[PDB]
Design a binder for this molecule. Structure first.
Ligand SMILES: [K+]
Ligand SMILES: [K+]
Ligand SMILES: [K+]
Ligand SMILES: [K+]
Ligand SMILES: [K+]
Ligand SMILES: [K+]
Ligand SMILES: [K+]
Ligand SMILES: [K+]
Ligand SMILES: [K+]
Ligand SMILES: [K+]
Ligand SMILES: [K+]
Ligand SMILES: [K+]
Ligand SMILES: [K+]
Ligand SMILES: [Mg+2]
Ligand SMILES: [Mg+2]
Ligand SMILES: [Mg+2]
Ligand SMILES: [Mg+2]
Ligand SMILES: [Mg+2]
Ligand SMILES: [Mg+2]
Ligand SMILES: [Mg+2]
Ligand SMILES: [Mg+2]
Ligand SMILES: [Mg+2]
Ligand SMILES: [Mg+2]
Ligand SMILES: [Mg+2]
Ligand SMILES: [Mg+2]
Ligand SMILES: [Mg+2]
Ligand SMILES: [Mg+2]
Ligand SMILES: [Mg+2]
Ligand SMILES: [Mg+2]
Ligand SMILES: [Mg+2]
Ligand SMILES: [Mg+2]
Ligand SMILES: [Mg+2]
Ligand SMILES: [Mg+2]
Ligand SMILES: [Mg+2]
Ligand SMILES: [Mg+2]
Ligand SMILES: [Mg+2]
Ligand SMILES: [Mg+2]
Ligand SMILES: [Mg+2]
Ligand SMILES: [Mg+2]
Ligand SMILES: [Mg+2]
Ligand SMILES: [Mg+2]
Ligand SMILES: [Mg+2]
Ligand SMILES: [Mg+2]
Ligand SMILES: [Mg+2]
Ligand SMILES: [Mg+2]
Ligand SMILES: [Mg+2]
Ligand SMILES: [Mg+2]
Ligand SMILES: [Mg+2]
Ligand SMILES: [Mg+2]
Ligand SMILES: [Mg+2]
Ligand SMILES: [Mg+2]
Ligand SMILES: [Mg+2]
Ligand SMILES: [Mg+2]
Ligand SMILES: [Mg+2]
Ligand SMILES: [Mg+2]
Ligand SMILES: [Mg+2]
Ligand SMILES: [Mg+2]
Ligand SMILES: [Mg+2]
Ligand SMILES: [Mg+2]
Ligand SMILES: [Zn+2]
Lengths: 84, 101, 50, 118, 60
RNA sequence: AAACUUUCAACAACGGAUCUCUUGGUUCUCGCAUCGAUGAAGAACGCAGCGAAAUGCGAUACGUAAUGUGAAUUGCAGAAUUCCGUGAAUCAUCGAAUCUUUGAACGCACAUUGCGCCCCUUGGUAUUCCAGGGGGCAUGCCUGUUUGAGCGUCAUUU
RNA sequence: UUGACCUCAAAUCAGGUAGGAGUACCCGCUGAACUUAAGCAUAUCAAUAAGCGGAGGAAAAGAAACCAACCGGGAUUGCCUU
RNA sequence: UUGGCGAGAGACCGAUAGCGAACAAGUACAGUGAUGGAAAGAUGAAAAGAACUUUGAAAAGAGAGUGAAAAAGUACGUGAA
RNA sequence: GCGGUUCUGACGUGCAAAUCGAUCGUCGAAUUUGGGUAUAGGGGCGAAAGACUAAUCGAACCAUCUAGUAGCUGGUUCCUG
RNA sequence: AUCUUGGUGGUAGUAGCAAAUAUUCAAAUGAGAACUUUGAAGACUGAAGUGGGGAAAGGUUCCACGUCAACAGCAGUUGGACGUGGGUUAGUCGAUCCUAAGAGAUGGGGAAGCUCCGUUUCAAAGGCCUGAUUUUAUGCAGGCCACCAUCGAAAGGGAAUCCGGUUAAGAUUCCGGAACCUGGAUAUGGAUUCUUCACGGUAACGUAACUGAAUGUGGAGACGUCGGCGCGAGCCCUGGGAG
RNA sequence: CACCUUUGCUGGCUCCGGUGCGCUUGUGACGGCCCGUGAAAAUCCACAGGAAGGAAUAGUUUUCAUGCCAGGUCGUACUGA
């Protein structure tokens, strides 16, 4: 009974969507994401899981602000405007 | 070996007391001036079964000395106490069944 | 699932919009190498896992 | 064709607000027409005009506020220079240049001299 | 029948319709459609005719 | 004898080796020092005349402003060809802005698009109710301001 | 009674500051076992991996409570040696 | 100084190699979850990507044509076993 | 309804990684069961079979240390002299 | 190397495609019909259903139009397929509110630290009422009480809606009619008062109303299970009559 | 009666009973059982109390009637084998 018949009883979710990382890893009863560790302040990561670090690091998303910083640094964090 | 049954009890998970239906902890009144120096009279309002416990409990109501209100205590009923009976608690209460001396 | 959360419904709406074959005119673009929609999903084949 | 921000910068607060509304009206009209027609690409020009006018409005309103805090210690964080968090926490030129009277005296008495070997 | 901002409640839709089309609203019913946009069913009062007003805004 | 089986060749299959290619990898060297409460990294949802992605972006949404270049963009449609110009472009540059919902994430919550309170303002007979618009309300710690508490305690005066 | 002082509070008080990310290298803490010893326990692997805290363009160290025993050297770091 | 940014190189690898990833790759897909994690490059100088005819319900065939070559037809260089 | 005795029946590259048929135990409580909730790996939970803990149990699963060690098994690619 | 990845054979047109009683005739459609549609017939589920709805779960599968390369282990003109669109309307149904087992900040105390404990504690832990003042919706006037965040049920607790009609596809949500609850505002009638805050009835209690702060006390919310008996409803059965 | 009419149009009836260890279900008053006596909170009401305010030519009262305004947000298709 442990196999096929028992797979019929699987219709309750142990995990739902995480607000922080978007994965289906928020454990409903522990109120804790198994992937990113929300709502701990720190993001969960381990040096034993390098491949997991690589899936989530800086550069895997949009950057949004951090992509422009090198350009800003190059021009000495200038302030005003270009003259004609 | 594995942790035996008698050691699992202290973690108190499935071994905690089943308290949903209990009336409250049975306890005498707090020992205050009236009880140290005189007596105070309460009424037995109810005599009631407590789940888990053999003995029935007695809901005794006393007036508050310092505020206009009533104060239900929960006593363990002594054999012979009845609803409506007055109970006397304190240094000067008389030697009758149900009184607190 | 009749009585569903908004968050779940919003994800389902996204999935509705993505469920389409490649627009044909993409194939005509210069240096195009996209042949077909390789991320097409179907309710009978693969579940969304929420 | 589209609006041009150099032309808008001549205009007043009220004129710009009025134009903004005329564009928002126009844009709605085209959104309706788009249902009937197959293709309607004029709508791009009027989206971008709206965005132009709002840019100019905001520029005017910000420069007004920059004038209101001219010279004052403390101004809105959004008008303070961005730089980086670490640069904004750094000692100012003044702070970093401070020396104690003891060291100022030594620095005058005994600067590094210019010299050459023959 | 309008598409309407997902942020819009029934109070704001009533007020917008009165303002944009100079018409009196009796009730607003709304739903969020399966594509994630919000549809509003706006019944006018008996003094106005929906077909006239729709012809003015110019979809027939 | 044929069929059949087997072997070899030619042509045809099957399959994707080989050869040639290479906007990718890898290693070494050189130079540089720049993330975030002024809201980062990361997430969600959106945005194009016609896109599902990748890429870009945030209701100003494959972008707005500024500067440079000097006529494209292109799959089609459309627009434009005063294009001898404050001016094309999925161009380069980038100092001004915009920057939904979030996230350290900060009114309280969150398997909820859940529930508050404060200030200004508009509408509904409105200080008190309901609604719209704008702006606010986290914690620890420092300096200071103000208002206080304690027979801890001094003087003075009952 | 009035005013100090000391100590301790409150405020959406005035102005600030910390947190999270990255983490190659750097400063600490904590801390294995596989393995080697032809077995194995001290030992080794290793004052390493994993875990935790904290920085910067470098960090740390640094102007002797130093080395020496010489005819004495003279902050720290790094290389070649030892 | 196996990270970030900007450069220059090699007796290095040449699509089963080299990073997992030359490509919409940390993607598709699996797993309740931590995690796990691919395959997949090459028509031609140019689409000139086969008008037209004919058989067929059609897919397609046969012609005709384009091209230096369809013994290059998108099931696309070569095309082994 | 819950269970699973016997046929040692069907099936045994299955309808199925435990099913099918008949026969059978129990059927108003130490009953059956949904949802919520608690207990987590030398740990849990056990009317006790070393049972059960996501087809995994006399110590789960995932990653890393780790290419762990092997006196043992298997393989180890051209020619002639 | 039971080597690694990829490809390909013989086996072989073979095992097989046999549970759940069952199909048949004609017409239509169409290149093509054992399998589509209509009609006719024959059967089955037999209300503890193969019927009508929902919860979990799925996520567009719903409905229409077009439509057959692949998929539906035969077929296919059909489809839960393929392409393109349409579609989910609420003061009253849910969520939202409440607390349950439980989960969990803060004050504090542990811990090198990630964090752990604990949930009202060895804390200076708040926020209402009323009049005003007519300066204004904050200080002022008074008073009043002080428990201890928060999360935790789409089956527990819980304010309030019904009928008829309507679509390709929605309906206790739309339309028509007819109601109701909560919050707010508010003035007309009625009632009450010169015995100021109603009268009647021996009484149980009656009535259209009929002042009432702090504070306190009660009630409802609010409860097992089985057994027979009574009563209601819907259904079943049955008489007469009108179709 | 209209007539491949928007799809009509007009008229009639839509009534009166019986029965029960019936079925299903609601409910009442009871009875049996326990070393088992079978949630909590929001929320709503009443009472005790007598604070306070209130008349005469005018005062009180919206727990009586009637009347006015508003009710946001998210779910809602379909399957349930
Ligand atoms: K099984
Ligand atoms: K290279
Ligand atoms: K602060
Ligand atoms: K690979
Ligand atoms: K060729
Ligand atoms: K043990
Ligand atoms: K598992
Ligand atoms: K172990
Ligand atoms: K040996
Ligand atoms: K509602
Ligand atoms: K509920
Ligand atoms: K209950
Ligand atoms: K009983
Ligand atoms: Mg198992
Ligand atoms: Mg279950
Ligand atoms: Mg669980
Ligand atoms: Mg997943
Ligand atoms: Mg709705
Ligand atoms: Mg932002
Ligand atoms: Mg302040
Ligand atoms: Mg080793
Ligand atoms: Mg050894
Ligand atoms: Mg050995
Ligand atoms: Mg050994
Ligand atoms: Mg380490
Ligand atoms: Mg730095
Ligand atoms: Mg240096
Ligand atoms: Mg230093
Ligand atoms: Mg010194
Ligand atoms: Mg030295
Ligand atoms: Mg590769
Ligand atoms: Mg050739
Ligand atoms: Mg070829
Ligand atoms: Mg061959
Ligand atoms: Mg059996
Ligand atoms: Mg057998
Ligand atoms: Mg067999
Ligand atoms: Mg045994
Ligand atoms: Mg080896
Ligand atoms: Mg090994
Ligand atoms: Mg056969
Ligand atoms: Mg068979
Ligand atoms: Mg058949
Ligand atoms: Mg039968
Ligand atoms: Mg039958
Ligand atoms: Mg269908
Ligand atoms: Mg078939
Ligand atoms: Mg076929
Ligand atoms: Mg479809
Ligand atoms: Mg309700
Ligand atoms: Mg805790
Ligand atoms: Mg709650
Ligand atoms: Mg309920
Ligand atoms: Mg329906
Ligand atoms: Mg209605
Ligand atoms: Mg029943
Ligand atoms: Mg429905
Ligand atoms: Mg249904
Ligand atoms: Mg059913
Ligand atoms: Zn997460």
């Amino acid at each position: 009974g442990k196999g096929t018949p028992s797979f019929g009883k699987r219709h309750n979710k142990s995990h739902t969507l995480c607000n922080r990382c978007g994965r289906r890893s928020f454990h409903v009863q522990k109120k804790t994401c198994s992937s990113c560790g929300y709502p701990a302040a720190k993001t969960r990561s381990y040096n034993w899981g390098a491949k997991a670090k690589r899936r989530h690091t800086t550069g895997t998303g949009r950057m949004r602000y951090l992509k422009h910083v090198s350009r800003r640094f190059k021009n000495g964090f200038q302030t005003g405007s270009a003259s004609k | 070996g594995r942790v035996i049954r008698n050691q699992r009890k202290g973690a108190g998970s499935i071994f905690t007391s089943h308290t949903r239906l209990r009336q409250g902890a049975a306890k005498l009144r707090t020992l205050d001036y009236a009880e140290r120096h005189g007596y105070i009279r309460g009424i037995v309002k109810q005599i009631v079964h407590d789940s888990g416990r053999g003995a029935p409990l007695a809901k005794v109501v006393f007036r508050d000395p310092y505020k206009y209100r009533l104060r239900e205590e929960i006593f363990i009923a002594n054999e012979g106490v009845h609803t409506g009976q007055f109970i006397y608690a304190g240094k000067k209460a008389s030697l009758n069944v149900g009184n607190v001396l | 699932a009749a009585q569903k959360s908004f968050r779940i419904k919003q994800k389902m709406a996204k999935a509705k919009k993505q469920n389409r074959p490649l627009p044909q005119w993409i194939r005509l673009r210069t240096n195009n190498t996209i042949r077909y929609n390789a991320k097409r999903r179907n309710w009978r084949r693969t579940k969304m896992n929420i | 064709a589209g609006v041009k921000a150099y032309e808008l910068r001549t205009k007043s607060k009220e004129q710009l607000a009025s134009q903004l509304v005329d564009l928002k009206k126009e844009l709605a009209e085209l959104k309706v027409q788009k249902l009937s027609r197959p293709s309607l690409p004029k709508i791009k020009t009027v989206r971008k005009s709206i965005a132009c006018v709002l840019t100019v409005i905001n520029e005017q309103q910000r420069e007004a506020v920059r004038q209101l805090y001219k010279g004052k210690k403390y101004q809105p964080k959004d008008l303070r220079a961005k730089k980086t968090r670490a640069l904004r926490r750094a000692l100012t030129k003044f702070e970093a240049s401070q020396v104690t009277e003891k060291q100022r005296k030594k620095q005058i008495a005994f600067p590094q001299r210019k010299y050459a070997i023959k | 029948v309008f598409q309407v901002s997902m942020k819009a409640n029934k109070y704001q839709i009533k007020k917008a319709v009165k303002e944009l089309y100079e018409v009196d609203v009796l009730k607003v019913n709304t739903l969020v459609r399966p594509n994630g946009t919000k549809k509003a069913y706006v019944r006018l009062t008996a003094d106005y005719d929906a077909l006239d007003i729709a012809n003015r805004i110019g979809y027939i």
